[PDB]
Amino acid sequence: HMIKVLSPAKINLGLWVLGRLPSGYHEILTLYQEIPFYDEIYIREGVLRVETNIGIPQEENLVYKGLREFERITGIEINYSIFIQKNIPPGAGLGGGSSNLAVVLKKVNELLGSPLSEEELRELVGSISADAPFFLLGKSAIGRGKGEVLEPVETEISGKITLVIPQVSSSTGRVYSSLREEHFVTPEYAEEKIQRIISGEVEEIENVLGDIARELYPEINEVYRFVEYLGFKPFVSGSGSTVYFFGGASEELKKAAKMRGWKVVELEL
Ligand SMILES: CCOC(=O)CC1(n2cc(C#CCNS(=O)(=O)C3CC3)c(N)nc2=O)COC1
Ligand SMILES: [Br-]
Ligand SMILES: [Cl-]
Ligand SMILES: [Cl-]
Numbered sequence: 152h153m154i155k156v157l158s159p160a161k162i163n164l165g166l167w168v169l170g171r172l173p174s175g176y177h178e179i180l181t182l183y184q185e186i187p188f189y190d191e192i193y194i195r196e197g198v199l200r201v202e203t204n205i206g207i208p209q210e211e212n213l214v215y216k217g218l219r220e221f222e223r224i225t226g227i228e229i230n231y232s233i234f235i236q237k238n239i240p241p242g243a244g245l246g247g248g249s250s251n252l253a254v255v256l257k258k259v260n261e262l263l264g265s266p267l268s269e270e271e272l273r274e275l276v277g278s279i280s281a282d283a284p285f286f287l288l289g290k291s292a293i294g295r296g297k298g299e300v301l302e303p304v305e306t307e308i309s310g311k312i313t314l315v316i317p318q319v320s321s322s323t324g325r326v327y328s329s330l331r332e333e334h335f336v337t338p339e340y341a342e343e344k345i346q347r348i349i350s351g352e353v354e355e356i357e358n359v360l361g362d363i364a365r366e367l368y369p370e371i372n373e374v375y376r377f378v379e380y381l382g383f384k385p386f387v388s389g390s391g392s393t394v395y396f397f398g399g400a401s402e403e404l405k406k407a408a409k410m411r412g413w414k415v416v417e418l419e420l
Contacts, residue, residue: 153195158235158254160188160245161285162388162395164308165348166358167341168334172297177327179298180341182348184306185289187418188314190239190247192255194262197232205237213252213279220275221256225266231259240414242320244389246282253286293345307351311399314388314416315378315408317370321391326363334359353397354384361387368392377407 161183169178201215209215218229233255239247253276260267267275269287276283281298293302347355364387365372371387374394378385381404383396400415408415 153193154258156192156194156254156258157189158192158239158247158250159286159289160186160239160247160250161282162186162245162312162314162393163358164306164353164386165344165356166360166389167336167338167344168330168359169338169341170335176297177330178296179294180338180345181294181298182304182306182345183285183292183294183298183301184308184420185285185291186245186312186314186420188239188245188416190251191236192251193234193236194255194258195232195234196230199229199231201233201235203235203237205241207237207241213248213283214255217252217256217276217279218259220279221259221267224271224275227263227266229259229263231262240316240320242322242392243316244321244323244387244391244393245314245316246280246286246389249276249280249282250286252276252280253283257287291349304349306349308348308353309420311397312418312420313396313398313400313404314414314418315374315394315396315404316414316416317368317374317392317394318412319368319370319392321364321368321371321389323360323390325367326360326390329363329367330359334363353386356386358387360390364391373411374413377404 164182164184166181201212273284277299291304291306371391375385378396383398385394400417
């Protein structure tokens with residue numbers, strides 16, 4: 152009884168770090184935007200299994216963790232064989248893993264008569280990824296706290312957006328480790344910026360994790376510089392590696408990408 156579900160990516164339309172929390176760990180402000188860029192997930196009745204087309208081991212897979220935890224918290228034994236075709240590259244700063252977790256858990260929770268409630272499902276996926284509960288609502292939301300405290304917003308942003316993803320996998324942990332006092336802003340500063348972005352002022356986007364990721368991973372910087380050369384303002388999603396801009400891909404971009412092994416994703420918002 153196999154079904155297919157799409158699992159969307161996000162971009163961060165701006166990110167600010169307010170400071171360190173005892174638990175690791177950083178308080179942030181960000182604007183999440185869902186983008187029409189999807190992993191395809193085939194769910195079939197069978198023995199619990201989570202496979203991808205890109206060799207993520209089952210034990211490492213957020214979706215598998217999530218479904219084992221579902222078993223724990225619910226006392227129901229899950230009989231679903233999961234295959235995920237990963238178009239959203241891990242380490243691209245687009246929340247593909249967290250998306251997979253949220254959508255699969257939401258689906259399996261329905262397919263099993265809805266044992267968990269909206270707030271529980273959210274606490275479950277949220278426990279694994281701070282990221283992950285944005286994907287239970289989608290569209291556009293402000294993330295506060297560590298990204299889990301969400302406020303749905305209506306954005307005045309539309310038209311072409313292009314993603315340029317280099318074949319470096321940004322380690323978010325290594326990015327947060329280059330953070331210094333100098334990178335933090337006040338929440339009031341960030342809230343004014345986000346308001347402006349929400350009203351369609353894309354030039355107000357900025358992200359210190361991107362600034363850092365460009366220093367640590369020279370290839371992110373190479374893409375950034377290339378996008379400027381092409382005559383667009385570049386921006387960085389998550390803590391990289393993705394660079395995006397508000398325009399279309401030229402043939403010269405497509406050529407540079409094929410040659411360098413960058414993925415170019417043209418979308419419309
Ligand atoms: C143990 C030390 O490492 C960390 O805690 C850094 C990490 N982190 C991650 C956070 C997050 C989040 C979700 N929003 S987001 O768009 O994906 C943003 C790119 C992080 C966060 N708010 N604070 C953090 O400190 C854990 O994943 C990166
Ligand atoms: Br610091
Ligand atoms: Cl079978
Ligand atoms: Cl690099």
